[PDB]
């Protein structure tokens, strides 16, 4: 009884083609990029992936910003708790505000 604009676009010759990569294949690429970053770091962007523990490659990344790596190993639990709280706050911000 209530006709939408899609049928008017449809009957007047205006169609929409589907994308080549569906939303499931984008998530597989995203999962591959996530599992390569966590388990290997930046070594999967150059050649083959080289495994390294996460608490050691974060000490690799404090050395990039000018902080010695004892700061991580003496404050590992605090940084882990701060990251978990940041991810929880990101969840709350995305589930609260739609703008």
């Amino acid at each position: 009884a209530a006709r939408d604009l899609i049928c008017a676009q449809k009957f007047n010759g205006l169609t929409v083609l589907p994308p080549l990569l569906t939303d499931e294949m984008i998530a597989q690429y995203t999962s591959a990029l996530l599992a390569g970053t966590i388990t290997s770091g930046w070594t999967f962007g150059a050649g083959a992936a080289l495994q390294i523990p996460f608490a050691m490659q974060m000490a690799y990344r404090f050395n990039g910003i000018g902080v010695t790596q004892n700061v991580l190993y003496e404050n590992q639990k605090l940084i882990a708790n701060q990251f978990n709280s940041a991810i929880g706050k990101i969840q709350d911000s995305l589930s609260s505000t739609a703008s």
């Binding site: 150059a46 050649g47 083959a48 080289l50 523990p53 190993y73």
Partner: peptide
């Protein structure tokens, strides 16, 4: 460019 070629497993430790 520079590409690493041949890899080997190792046992590591932070300190």
């Amino acid at each position: 460019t520079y590409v690493p070629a041949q890899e080997k497993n190792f046992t590591t430790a932070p300190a």
